[PDB]
Amino acid sequence: IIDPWIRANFVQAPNGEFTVSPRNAPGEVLLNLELGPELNPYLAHLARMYNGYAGGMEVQVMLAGNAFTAGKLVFAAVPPHFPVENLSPQQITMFPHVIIDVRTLEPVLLPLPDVRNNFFHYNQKDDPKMRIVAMLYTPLRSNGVFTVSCRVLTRPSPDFDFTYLVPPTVESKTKPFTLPILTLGELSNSRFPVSIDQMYTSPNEVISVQCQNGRCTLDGELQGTTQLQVSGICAFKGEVTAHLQDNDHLYNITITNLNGSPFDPSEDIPAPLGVPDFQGRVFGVITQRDKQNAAGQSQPANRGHDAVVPTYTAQYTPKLGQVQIGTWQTDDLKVNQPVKFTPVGLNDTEHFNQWVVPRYAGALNLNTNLAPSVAPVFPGERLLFFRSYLPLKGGYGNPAIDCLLPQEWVQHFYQEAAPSMSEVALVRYINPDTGRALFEAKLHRAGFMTVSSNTSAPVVVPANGYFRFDSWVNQFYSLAPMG
């Protein structure tokens, strides 16, 4: 079935690119890949039309170093159900292996067999398979800071074959990860219902964030209070159940879900979906349309006013089903009638902290079912944000919400739901008139981006640039410096 061009020529793997520097030590696994069609884009296209597969492959490795470096790498094949975590460089020579110097101008070849105890593999129902492992065999001396770039190419062996025809692109587990082609003038903020202004790198005191809107993994798993509508970010609806007099007016509100269903407090969610996930005074518009008809040509009556929702206080308890608003010196809200809130911005920058999570069940309770905190782990990297600027009702300031993902990428990751081949995907930011990349970043499975920078500053880009998915990499991959 396979075209004889495919069987004769090597094509770059989707898990292909890696690095080796003299900051690496012999004993660290630089490359750990698994057998299967995902190592070849033509086979990855043909795999979406069949049910199963069997067969081994052939791997070519290119190294790019000069005549001023020294050292040896080793590439070996490791069978299924063998532990890989405590391999030493002495043990890896007891496998089918190849040892190469870094000064060479010629690529390296290794066959990767398909050792199995059955007739074929299924695309669903995964099972362990053969792997290829690379570690540094002798220490790397770049005498006369020099990072060496490396690529992996594959092609099928003469015994590789596909088994049963299924309808194309229906069966999952064969879908490739794609990233949508949208510019920053077309993306939207995911933690507040405005549009994205620029890209920005994190401050020196921000090393770990935990937000609850705009959290979604690359596999398409919504987390926290993340929903899909832009009109539902920082918005809620329900009925007024209470009234209070103060300097102001208070209007306690029992909230429901945004589809109209009542909110069950025992669900595995921190709060109803789409409530604000930061501390501050959210400014917006509250509105009522009545449920009974006063005469009025057989129509209901309507109210709409300005309101403030403070989320740092003891009465912002959306997990318990309550929220309290405020109208400055206005009393026109009927009790026992439905309300809807539409967010506009903030009132002032008082008690405004964007990286502090509210107490969703109030005081005397702990937040449960929270999305996990994210952070960079590689030495010398920081978080990358998408920054918008918000309106204020009064006072002085220039407030800003940062987000981890654009809302359109959340939507695309939900609709596609492709499997993740590794822990980190390498992306680049392409200038489409020339083809030159501007910077490169890491995109993690949990849904956040890190760059290699020393400053907290806005990122100056052209107007038509976009991100492009290039490869799946591992944790040892060393990004080029952004500045």
**Torsion, CA 70, CA 76, CA 81, CA 85, rounded to 10:** 0
Name the one range near Zn ion by CB under 5 A: 72-80, 202-210, 249-257, 374-382: 249-257
Q: Quick one: 122 exposed, middle or buried, by C-beta within 10 A (0-12, 13-18, 19+)?
A: middle
Query: Which residues have C-beta within 8 Å of that of residue 366, sequence separation ≥ 6?
Result: none
CA-nearest of 234, 170, 161 to 407 is 234
Residue that the structure tokens 């959340």 belong to: 410
Name the one range near Zn ion by CB under 5 A: 62-70, 204-212, 237-245, 335-343: 237-245
Biggest CA–CA distance in the chain, Å, is 92
Least CB distance to Zn ion at residue 330 (A): 8
249 binds Zn ion (CB under 5 A): yes
Count of residues engaged in binding Zn ion, rule: CB under 5 A: 3
In the bound state, the residue with its beta carbon closest to Zn ion is: 249
By beta-carbon proximity to Zn ion, the closer residue of 152 and 286 is 286
DSSP β-ladder status, 252-255 and 322-324:
antiparallel
Ramachandran quadrant class, 370 (left: phi over 0; alpha: psi -120 to 50; beta: rest): beta
By beta-carbon proximity to Zn ion, the closer residue of 48 and 249 is 249
By beta-carbon proximity to Zn ion, the closer residue of 131 and 249 is 249
Residues annotated within the binding site are 243, 245, 249
Ramachandran quadrant class, 464 (left: phi over 0; alpha: psi -120 to 50; beta: rest): alpha
Least CB distance to Zn ion at residue 349 (A): 27
332 binds Zn ion (CB under 5 A): no
Least CB distance to Zn ion at residue 365 (A): 28
By beta-carbon proximity to Zn ion, the closer residue of 246 and 433 is 246
Least CB distance to Zn ion at residue 286 (A): 13
> What are the tokens at 320?
């318990």
Name the one range near Zn ion by CB under 5 A: 86-94, 259-267, 326-334, 401-409: 326-334
Applying the rule CB under 5 A, the residues between 435 and 454 that interact with Zn ion are none
331 binds Zn ion (CB under 5 A): yes
Query: Element (H or E) spanning 410, and its range?
Result: helix 407-416
Name the one range near Zn ion by CB under 5 A: 45-53, 323-331, 356-364, 430-438: 323-331
Q: What string of H, E and C letters represents the secondary structure of 130-168? A: CEEEEEECCCCEECCCCCEEEEEEEEECCCCEECCECCC
Residues annotated within the binding site for Zn(2+) are 243, 245, 249
Binding mask 190-229 for Zn ion (x = CB under 5 A): ----------------------------------------
Name the one range near Zn ion by CB under 5 A: 31-39, 330-338, 393-401, 449-457: 330-338
Query: Contact positions toward Zn ion, by CB under 5 A?
Result: 245, 249, 331
